Swiss-Prot record, chain B:
Lineage, top ranks: Bacteria, Pseudomonadati, Pseudomonadota, Gammaproteobacteria, Enterobacterales
Subunit record text: The RNAP catalytic core consists of 2 alpha, 1 beta, 1 beta' and 1 omega subunit. When a sigma factor is associated with the core the holoenzyme is formed, which can initiate transcription. The rRNA transcription and antitermination complex (rrnTAC) consists of RNAP, NusA, NusB, NusE (rpsJ), NusG, SubB, ribosomal protein S4, DNA and precursor rRNA; S4 is more flexible than other subunits. In pull-down experiments interacts with CedA. (Microbial infection) Interacts (via flap domain) with Escherichia phage lambda antitermination protein Q; this interaction renders bacterial RNAP resistant to transcription pausing and allows it to read through termination signals.
Name the record gives this protein: DNA-directed RNA polymerase subunit beta
Role summary: DNA-dependent RNA polymerase (RNAP) catalyzes the transcription of DNA into RNA using the four ribonucleoside triphosphates as substrates. Resistance to the antibiotics salinamide A, salinamide B, rifampicin, streptolydigin, CBR703, myxopyronin, and lipiarmycin can result from mutations in this protein.
Species annotation: Escherichia coli (strain K12)
Residues of the full protein shown: 349 to 398 of 1342
Biotechnological exploitation: Co-administration of salinamide and rifampicin or salinamide and myxopyronin suppresses the emergence of resistance to both antibiotics.
Swiss-Prot record, chain D:
Function noted in UniProt: DNA-dependent RNA polymerase (RNAP) catalyzes the transcription of DNA into RNA using the four ribonucleoside triphosphates as substrates.
Protein name: DNA-directed RNA polymerase subunit beta'
Sections of the chain in a coiled coil: none
Originating species: Escherichia coli (strain K12)
UniProt family annotation: Belongs to the RNA polymerase beta' chain family.
Biotech utility: Co-administration of salinamide and rifampicin or salinamide and myxopyronin suppresses the emergence of resistance to both antibiotics.
Shown residues within the full chain: 102 to 201 of 1407
PTM per Swiss-Prot/TrEMBL: Acetylated on several lysine residues in the presence of glucose.
Subunit structure: The RNAP catalytic core consists of 2 alpha, 1 beta, 1 beta' and 1 omega subunit. When a sigma factor is associated with the core the holoenzyme is formed, which can initiate transcription. The rRNA transcription and antitermination complex (rrnTAC) consists of RNAP, NusA, NusB, NusE (rpsJ), NusG, SubB, ribosomal protein S4, DNA and precursor rRNA; S4 is more flexible than other subunits.
Amino acid sequence: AAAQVLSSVESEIGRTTDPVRMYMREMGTVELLTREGEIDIAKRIEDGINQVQCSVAEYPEAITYLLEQYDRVEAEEARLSDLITGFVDPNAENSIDPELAREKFAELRAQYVVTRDTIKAKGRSHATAQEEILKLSEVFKQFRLVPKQFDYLVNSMRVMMDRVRTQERLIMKLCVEQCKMPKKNFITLFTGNETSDTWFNAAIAMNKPWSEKLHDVSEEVHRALQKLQQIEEETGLTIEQVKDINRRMSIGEAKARRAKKEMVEANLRLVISIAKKYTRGLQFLDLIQEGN
Amino acid sequence: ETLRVDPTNDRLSALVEIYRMMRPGEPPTREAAESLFENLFFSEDRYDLS
Amino acid sequence: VPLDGGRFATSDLNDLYRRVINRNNRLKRLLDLAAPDIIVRNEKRMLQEA
Amino acid sequence: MGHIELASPTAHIWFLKSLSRIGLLLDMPLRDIERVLYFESYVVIEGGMTNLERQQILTEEQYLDALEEFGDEFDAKMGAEAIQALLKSMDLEQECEQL
């Protein structure tokens, strides 16, 4: 309840124009943890990290993205470029050697093909096909890459989901706003097929005279369908799985950000203590900001 | 007549008001007000008459 | 302007311009870094004061 | 002459401290303007509900209740850009015909 005394201090301030004491008063609410807060916050960060690892796990093309660039330098007779640092670098619970990079890749090529034919058997949701996909993820899980190339891997999902979200919005941009498409049935009909025109002409089967004269705008409402199905074909992943991918990656990254936040303010007193020995070359607050 | 205008009743409130007086905005604590008031006129380092 | 003795001297306006630019670029760096709002408020106060 | 591109909009000091020219236009207390400037007190840009009201002073604790009650329905934020948005939203012809 450290903010309750703020309701009595701020409401009765002398309207002080010194920013430094406003800064201290604002960060004085937090407390100093020890021996449990650090460990708990680190655990809450690492679970978010491995949640992100699971987020890159379900993408079929990310595993191929790990390898095609190394195939560019594998045939070069030497990989002196810095991209060799962004190799798998497996975790053990150093210069990259062929006895490690290629040995780790020996099973990667096998998993690249053993998970293809099994998926076609007994549909995509087949038990052993899905566990083989999970194993192909697991051989990806035993890696420890660098954040440089990794920083684009997360955006490889982020831009894709942004594209699908914009395509979904485009339907409302084109017809729902002007033609007053009631979302009560649209949400149910979109999740039914989302591959063909079963619900689109089911909406013609119903009375819906607003949608009856859709022939004037037929060739601009189904181009969104064309693009969505094109995304489905090129990505090779169904819309059912990508939403689950984005649903649980967002919560993981938000949890990691929240865990970092809950800790950073707890250690501002170290910064404010260490900064003041270094003043006066620049200022009294710019030092604090840079220390932050 | 001055006691009729004084809004403090004891040492703690007086020191809180004095801390708010010298250092407005900063929330007062139990020991900071005492230290500040002692340093105002009872610290050899920060006060002298010759 | 350089002086004769290999020295320099400049108007204080140059110092203020440097001061505002130094924290303006820092504020730019505090957005992509996803700074906590508590410190972004402090940076914005720094910029306003500058 | 050159220009400096700022990330967060900032308030001019002449039309703020001198007398007010930013307070008279907004019909707001000068002290509350400073409180909002220092990122201490929120302002209601738009109240979708009848509980809130345009140009209301808000403390952080009192603002948490608004967050847990309504959220997206109202528009209340922090900083000088809130004042800029208030200036953008207000209309002076209506004040001319009303006052």
